[PDB]
Design a protein around this ligand. Structure first.
Ligand code: CA
Ligand code: CA
Lengths: 138, 148, 133, 148
DNA sequence: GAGGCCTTCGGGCTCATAACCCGAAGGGA
DNA sequence: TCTCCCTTCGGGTTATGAGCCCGAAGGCC
């Protein structure tokens, strides 16, 4: 009906939609031998982006995402998708790899200390900024 | 942004809808064919034309057109869609994440512009209204071809 | 990863379809039972694309496969730039590893050989599909 | 007979296979709204290519391409050339000879309108395009140049 | 049976994409 | 004395794809 191969498919399409809303271009590679799923044309500058989907986990009120480079590396941005809340976390390369195993995402209605990841919730400006910065180093 | 970007957004929106309803999605290669998408509905394939609507300034409602245009130096000529050009036409309103789905005939049967009203209106509403989220019509056409 | 070999087979197929003026459609993700679908003069035909590897002993090429859906399958040989196009029924009517002989070794060439570049079979099933209305 | 975009999509498809057979990555875009047709991943660096399919110029016996995006369906002809930053390499194609010319942007835009490919025997001079026959190394250079 | 609010239609647009035609320019040889 | 060869360069052309504007008709109620 709708397995893991399909959950990742929606996540990919969601990211494409967001990029299109941002007015950006979007390039798709041939086959899955490359290290990144998508690339966004942010006003001329091409940025590699890996798409990731999250799972609801445990009890628990909060979502989880994983990074498996054992079964590639080097993109620019990782985008995590939460199907239920139709929202994206956007992580830069270094921040994404700097996590050990799992990355905890916590939505909920606040009133506690949030994880490191929380500052990257819907943080599409970070990729918007990398494009502008990389234009000037050229 | 410039025209084609808007279309691509609507087209993308359509794609997501089909995926959420567990249908397969096929993208054609290059803006050359008379349809934007086709959906693998439980085995059979149905071509889909996607159009993005615009809110009219005066009337206060969203409208699409069913004609294709060419305007060269001397004169301008139009090419409407034939019946076999696709199987369904989906109109997208962007600000309200909203789809009307029309069969080909119901779509070509219009003269040119085809208005969609979302206001309370109190009028009896035009024949378009009967197609708000008509995703069942594409599902039904699916089982209609399913047997022998 | 031999995923590249498959990639090359597919892009060759795509090119062949365009070389005969058809439309080509490409499914998002790999959930479906077909790799490609051609728009032949209006009619949509699914197609599986599989690549072949050269036999160790004999000078031959072999391709492995693992009614409804499919309706066509195209087999690629890189070095000798040609396709074997099998209708689904003929295709499943094989044990496991279907063999292809391309050498001119005089001997009675197998059942497979009849499907050399038979792109007319696609065109036929396409024209015949218009008779059902 | 079905024309124009089909021919362009074939030339594009030829470039797809060339790139792949040189072990490069190939990226295909959204739809026909960007100033480039393909993007090659060359040793990790992404470069933009603009594909154009040539035609046999019957009078001159050459294969030719226009370097200016001439935009019609407007009742007024406007000729907008390409910018230096619209892409990295323009690849002219000769189907029938399965031939590719690769031009860098700066040399591609530097032409006024038409660029000719001689490809015939016994001529007085060679065209300024001559040293660009199958010049895929030029896109290896820029890329090695990009890294560091 | 009146003055609207309200749809249809069929003219007129603009942006992008792709490939082609040809009469002179006017430097190489 | 190259003076014809033949590349080049601004005018012309076609097809496809997107989404739009607006006003004379005329219906709903
Ligand atoms: Ca469309
Ligand atoms: Ca092009």
């Amino acid at each position: 009906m709708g397995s893991t191969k399909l959950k990742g498919d929606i996540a990919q399409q969601a990211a494409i939609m967001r990029a299109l809303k941002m007015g950006w271009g979007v390039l798709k590679p041939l086959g899955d031998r490359l290290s990144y799923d998508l690339v966004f044309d942010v006003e001329g500058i091409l940025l590699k982006v890996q798409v990731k989907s999250s799972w609801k986990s445990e009890k628990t009120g909060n979502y989880v995402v994983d990074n498996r480079r054992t079964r590639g590396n080097d993109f620019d941005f990782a985008v995590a998708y939460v199907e239920e809340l139709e929202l994206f976390y956007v992580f830069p390369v270094d921040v994404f790899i700097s996590y050990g195993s799992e990355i905890h995402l916590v939505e909920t209605d606040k009133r506690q200390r949030k994880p490191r990841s929380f500052g990257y919730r819907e943080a599409w400006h970070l990729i918007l900024q990398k494009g502008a910065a990389q234009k000037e180093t050229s």
